[PDB]
């Protein structure tokens, strides 16, 4: 089997991408944030505290003839940005882009933190990291991809995120028309539960490539590119007037600036992030200070190849027995 679904930016900045997901019978379609940095499929629901729902579409398990309470199971997750959610668990039929999994754990939110409530466009998350990170207790549950894997034509999914445009998540096949050149594959460590890999270096604009190992994670659920402070300083030093602002929470730059590209290495291959992808616009409405899309990871503990980086590539998440990542230009 295969599946193919369009993923759409939630706003004009590409802050996140939503993909329609069919849950239950008859289908209830919710727009989920596919997140290769986490491993829970959780949804706003008829159980979510009413004051914490503000425009999201909810899953109502009582209206699904295939929903079954997973007795005794609870979940609770905290994300790298400080947001969180928790609740109970149903199993139900879940379909993405024509690919159907029966018995998928659907984690129904009883509580969500304010950032989720305030984002009316995101009805939940669909985690695509390794199932070892799934938070369901006392019986950890498998991700949608893990459940689908054996049925797929090939045990892979691909992320093709658009810049200011829709893109595609495919399951079970590699669309050879969706990228240019060849796909360069690179080793993955699953020791932390992430799609963790090592970039071979970077360049700023037309500058020389610096060969240096940068361990990080491919994370579709993180907006920005978070790299070591040395790398980030070297990038922003090429933008007149850019500076790190403690009050804003990162590097800002004059909105009048033209940003240089940023290149990262994948083996001997190179992925170029155009400068425009690094502009996240005014820090507040009407400001001439703009927020940068490359930020320091120093306070995180891990480097994160988020959407800013991934949307410059066609990315293969190869879930074979020994997983690997593939990157192609497009």
Swiss-Prot record:
Residues at the active site: 35, 199
Disulphide-bridged cysteine pairs: 255-290
Naturally occurring in which organism (per UniProt): Cryphonectria parasitica
The protein's name: Endothiapepsin
Family per similarity comment: Belongs to the peptidase A1 family.
Keyword terms: Aspartyl protease, Disulfide bond, Hydrolase, Protease, Signal, Zymogen
Domain Peptidase A1 positions: 17-328
Catalytic reaction(s) noted: Hydrolysis of proteins with specificity similar to that of pepsin A, prefers hydrophobic residues at P1 and P1', but does not cleave 14-Ala-|-Leu-15 in the B chain of insulin or Z-Glu-Tyr. Clots milk
